[PDB]
Design a protein around this ligand. Structure first.
Ligand SMILES: [Co+2]
Length: 258
């Protein structure tokens, strides 16, 4: 079978096809605020998404995805713990089957209903494929979702989710603004980690936003109606596609706030 989140192909199995699964820099991790430490050396985080330009949304059988045009520095990430410019290439959503779970990272063991990931690559490598092969090739912004008031920025995509219900489906979508996913505050935690899905490469500088954004019950439920399976196959809801917290292995989690 292909890796996934089921009993026979889930996170606990990954290590057999990807030994790195048991690495020293694996993600996600639980953010222990008693341990996380404020770092003065961190510069202001710069999230320039004004020129952002989305291309399409798609169901790859692993999570809801949206691809961006990364040919130019239209939507980039700089500052914070980053050296240079990191270009936004894609974003995906880790969702739970229940409100009390779904987020990959946890804060003092607390899980959120979901977690969005905005992936950027170090332009110093000229290509996303080459960046993932480097320790500092990726910068992923993590954003926690909790239920409550509806997130205006999510409604547009939420209304067309049926067009990418099953694996392998995709739909053009040029108006997905990642700016509309950001919380008010940009306070965050950083730490060296990896991709949270195979190949689990440890090429990521994680920037997890402290403040979660709100999404309505209805928006969450629409996201939970997506399928892991393909068309014609037995329905398997795309829920609980999150990897649990991995060992911190003495890595240091830095806070951008006092
Ligand atoms: Co992810």
């Amino acid at each position: 079978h292909h890796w996934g989140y089921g009993k026979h192909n889930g996170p606990e199995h990954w290590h057999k096809d990807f030994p790195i699964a048991k690495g020293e820099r694996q993600s996600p991790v639980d953010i222990d605020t008693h341990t996380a430490k404020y770092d003065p050396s961190l510069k202001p985080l710069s999230v320039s998404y004004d020129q952002a330009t989305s291309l399409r949304i798609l169901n790859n059988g692993h999570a809801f995805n949206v691809e961006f045009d990364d040919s130019q520095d239209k939507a980039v990430l700089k500052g914070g713990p980053l050296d240079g410019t990191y270009r936004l290439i894609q974003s995906h959503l880790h969702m739970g089957s229940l409100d009390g779970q779904g987020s990959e990272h946890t804060v003092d063991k607390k899980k959120y209903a979901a977690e969005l990931h905005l992936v950027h690559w170090n332009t110093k490598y000229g290509d996303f494929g080459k960046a993932v092969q480097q320790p500092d090739g990726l910068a992923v912004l993590g954003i926690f979702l909790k239920v409550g008031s509806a997130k205006p920025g999510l409604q547009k995509v939420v209304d067309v989710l049926d067009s990418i219900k099953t694996k392998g489906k995709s739909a053009d979508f040029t108006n997905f603004d990642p700016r509309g996913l950001l919380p008010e505050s940009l306070d965050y935690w950083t730490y060296p980690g990896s991709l949270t899905t195979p190949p689990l490469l440890e090429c990521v500088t994680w920037i997890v936003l402290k403040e979660p954004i709100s999404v309505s019950s209805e928006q969450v439920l629409k996201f939970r109606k997506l399928n892991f399976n393909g068309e014609g196959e037995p329905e398997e809801l795309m829920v609980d596609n999150w990897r649990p917290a991995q060992p911190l292995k003495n890595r240091q989690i830095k806070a951008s706030f006092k």
